[PDB]
């Protein structure tokens, strides 16, 4: 069946009989927002690879390459906790929706999980999760006992935290999976990879449900749309694609002429009408997620921007970057 | 409020105990060891980021031998462009390997994040390519076809045999030719020839010229 894939993929292309940005081109766009730096969270020293927000929309963690996981206050610019790491080649970080747990993880093939609310006044390492053989690249949190890690041995996983070992492993990836996003609809997640595909996996079932190819080059940014029915992919060739889980084709790909370099992070506002993407041109960019125009540029950084996140209500947006400064807009 | 005024001697007290910690992550020099197979890169100086540290003239170095799934090196190499030098080790051995292990030096040189950091070429086991050619059975002209067409220029190495130094300087000129083709003056290669104990100091006085070629550009000279 070497040629069997060319018949289903050509038939599924017929189910996608249009694009996105022609029906929403006539609607009222964003225009030009200048989400200026309300606060500016200074204190990291090396570059910054990942931040994750809080559930209360006022705390956030951030992961840096000096071996620090700093828990911030979005309101008073306050170092709530600064968690010293052991493996400082950190490429990802996460925050539990209970607000009790954070988890780091990077090139040392390991996901360490940290407990926030404790007695004896600390943030302790709860469950260090070995079991990967490649560089860990995106950890998330579905529950205080469910973490979905993506790694550099081409394997997505799923773990029982209290036990200490995996419950599932999600294979089917040629290149390394770089970035993962859990869904609001709690039974699915998605992960893009270096082989320009993005295998929609399944939390409850076990096997990777759908596939999503379409980039010219590798992929390093995944985020769910907040309805859980779509998601946007940020690649390393200045193409920021969006898809749909039950359509499997390209929803829209936000591209401009002046961007030639990689798109390190992708996030979404609470409306699902602000696609925020962090590029290698030493500055962010606000895309309107429907009409796909440059409707805002969050140029405040001097080096490449690697992370992004909108709150659980849409109020603020923090961006870290390699300038060691994480800058919350409003 | 006095609660939030006590939630602000956190951020002024974390930085007292964090910026004093982040001033140790810039006093040691970073290197990146990168050798393919049977290259002896674990034996040049003496869980998946096996990293060693060594200090010469009181300058702590810190190289990162990264054991990955394959030699693609595409996406974990972005973490190492704050680094002074990529120490590249490759052996004096079979010539079907040294046409791929010199197509290794060409994907490290023509990279994107590595377009500023200058690679060190650290050729190991210098006393095992003579023993490959003093036996004479090594068909060096077979794999490398243009080897017999040229010969050595002056300033040869003092066991000063010309038939091996014609080959010793051939592979070095084979890699400098892939170095200085498209290098743009920002980064240049620094070849060597050693399993000897002249290995550590030859990275010390060589990363200096990687630094000194930035302060000839940073300090407006």
């Amino acid at each position, epitope marked *: 069946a070497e040629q069997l894939k060319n018949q289903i993929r050509d038939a599924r292309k017929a189910c996608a009989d249009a694009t996105l940005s022609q029906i929403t081109n006539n609607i009222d766009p964003v225009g030009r927002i200048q989400m200026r730096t309300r606060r500016t969270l200074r204190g990291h020293l090396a570059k910054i690879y990942a931040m994750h927000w*809080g559930t*209360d929309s*006022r*705390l956030l963690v951030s992961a840096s390459q000096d071996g620090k996981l700093i828990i911030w*206050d*979005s*309101y*008073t610019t*306050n170092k*709530v*906790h600064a968690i010293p790491l052991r493996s400082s080649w950190v490429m990802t970080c996460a925050y539990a929706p209970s*607000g009790n747990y954070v988890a780091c993880g990077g090139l040392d093939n390991i996901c360490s999980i940290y407990n926030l*609310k404790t*007695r*004896e*006044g*600390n943030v302790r390492v709860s469950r260090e999760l070995a079991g990967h053989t490649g560089y860990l690249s995106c950890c998330r949190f579905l529950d205080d006992n469910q973490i979905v890690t993506s790694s550099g041995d081409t394997t997505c996983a799923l773990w029982d935290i209290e036990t200490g070992q995996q419950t599932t492993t999600f294979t089917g990836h040629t290149g390394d999976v770089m970035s993962l996003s859990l869904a609001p609809d709690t039974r699915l997640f998605v992960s893009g990879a270096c082989d320009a595909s993005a295998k929609l996996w399944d939390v409850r079932e076990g096997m990777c449900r759908q596939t999503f190819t379409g980039h010219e080059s590798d992929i390093n940014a995944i985020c769910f749309f907040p309805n859980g029915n779509a998601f946007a992919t940020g690649s390393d060739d200045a193409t920021c694609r969006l898809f749909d889980l039950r359509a499997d084709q390209e929803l829209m790909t936000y591209s401009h002429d002046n961007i030639i370099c990689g798109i390190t992070s992708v996030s979404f506002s609470k409306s699902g009408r602000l696609l925020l993407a962090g590029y290698d041109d030493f500055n962010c960019n606000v895309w309107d997620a429907l009409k796909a125009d440059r409707a805002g540029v969050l140029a405040g950084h001097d080096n490449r921007v690697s992370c992004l996140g909108v709150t659980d209500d849409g109020m603020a947006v923090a961006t870290g970057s390699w300038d060691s400064f994480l800058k919350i807009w409003n | *409020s*006095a*609660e*939030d005024k*006590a*939630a602000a*001697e*956190r951020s*002024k*007290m974390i930085d007292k105990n964090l910026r004093e910690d982040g001033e140790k992550a810039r006093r040691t020099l970073r290197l990146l060891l990168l050798g393919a197979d049977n290259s002896g890169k674990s034996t040049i100086v003496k869980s998946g980021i096996f990293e060693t540290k060594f200090q010469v003239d009181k300058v702590n170095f810190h190289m990162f031998d990264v054991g990955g799934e394959r030699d693609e090196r595409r996406k974990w190499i972005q973490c190492f462009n704050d680094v002074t030098a990529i120490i590249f080790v490759v052996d004096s051995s079979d010539y079907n390997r040294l046409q791929e292990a010199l197509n290794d030096f060409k994907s490290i040189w023509n990279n994107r994040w590595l377009r500023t950091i200058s690679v060190i070429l650290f050729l190991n086991k210098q006393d095992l390519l003579a023993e490959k050619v003093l036996a004479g059975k090594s068909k060096i002209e077979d794999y490398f076809p243009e080897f017999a067409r040229y010969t050595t220029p002056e300033d040869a190495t003092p066991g000063e045999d010309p038939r091996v130094t014609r080959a010793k300087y051939f592979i070095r000129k084979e890699f400098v030719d892939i170095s200085t083709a498209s290098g743009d003056g920002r980064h240049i290669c620094y070849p060597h020839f050693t399993v000897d104990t002249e290995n550590a100091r030859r990275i010390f006085n060589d990363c200096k010229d990687i630094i000194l070629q930035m302060n000839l550009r940073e300090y407006n000279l």
Partner: single-chain antibody, 208 residues
Framework: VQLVESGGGLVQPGGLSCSAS????????MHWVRQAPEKGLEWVAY????????YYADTVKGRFTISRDDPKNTLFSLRSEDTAMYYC??????????????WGQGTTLTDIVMTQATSSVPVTPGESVSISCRSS???????????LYWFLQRPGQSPQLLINLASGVPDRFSGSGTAFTLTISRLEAEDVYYC????????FGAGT
């Protein structure tokens, strides 16, 4: 996190330490709270994280001192109001914290005003034990968080915390600006209630 203080000896008022054990006091506040043999609670002192944000009682400003030996996680001119039993408070503040919670075993040697709301009620189980409270000013800041601190105690023992809803305490314990009520139901045994505020260094308004 088991805390403990030092007792102290009976000395005339005008002629202490909380050597707590086995936790991280270098990231916690370190209070003192006096409790009278006849009346109840009153605030005493403070030292924050970092050597020195020291407050003092208005009747003890210049009296016995407070400290924090943050390496060892330890701690090192009275009156008739200062002839009370001192009991310590563990607390630390961040945007989501539940401060004031753990109390030492302190029965030691011998102001924005807030209401009391019938300070003498005996034990009636089974039904709602709803106590109201009020303060002389609007506790609610512009952020949107009413900073009320409603405490508990035990007959012949140390205090604890009930109100939001702190930790280490049971579940059955449970408002507006300038006036707020609680809805506690289904009272059980091992039950000296309190309600305080901490918007400034003055202090609960009563002594129940």
């Amino acid at each position: 996190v088991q805390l403990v203080e030092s007792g102290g000896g009976l000395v005339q008022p005008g002629g202490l330490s909380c050597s707590a054990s086995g936790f991280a006091f270098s990231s916690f506040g370190m209070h003192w709270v006096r409790q009278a043999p006849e009346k109840g609670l009153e605030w005493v002192a403070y030292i924050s994280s970092g050597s020195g944000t020291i407050y003092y009682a208005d009747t003890v400003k210049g009296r016995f001192t407070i400290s924090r030996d943050d390496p060892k996680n330890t701690l090192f001119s009275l009156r008739s109001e200062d002839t009370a039993m001192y009991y310590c408070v563990r607390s630390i503040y961040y945007y989501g914290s539940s401060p004031f919670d753990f109390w030492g075993q302190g029965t030691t040697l011998t102001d924005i005003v807030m209401t009391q709301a019938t300070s003498s009620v005996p034990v009636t189980p089974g039904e709602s034990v709803s106590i109201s409270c009020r303060s002389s000013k609007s506790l609610l800041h512009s952020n949107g968080n009413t900073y009320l601190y409603w405490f508990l105690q035990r007959p012949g023992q140390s205090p604890q915390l009930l109100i939001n809803l702190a930790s280490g305490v049971p579940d059955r314990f449970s408002g507006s600006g300038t006036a707020f009520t609680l809805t506690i139901s289904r009272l059980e045994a091992e039950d000296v209630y309190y309600c305080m505020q901490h918007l400034e260094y003055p202090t609960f308004g009563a002594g129940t």
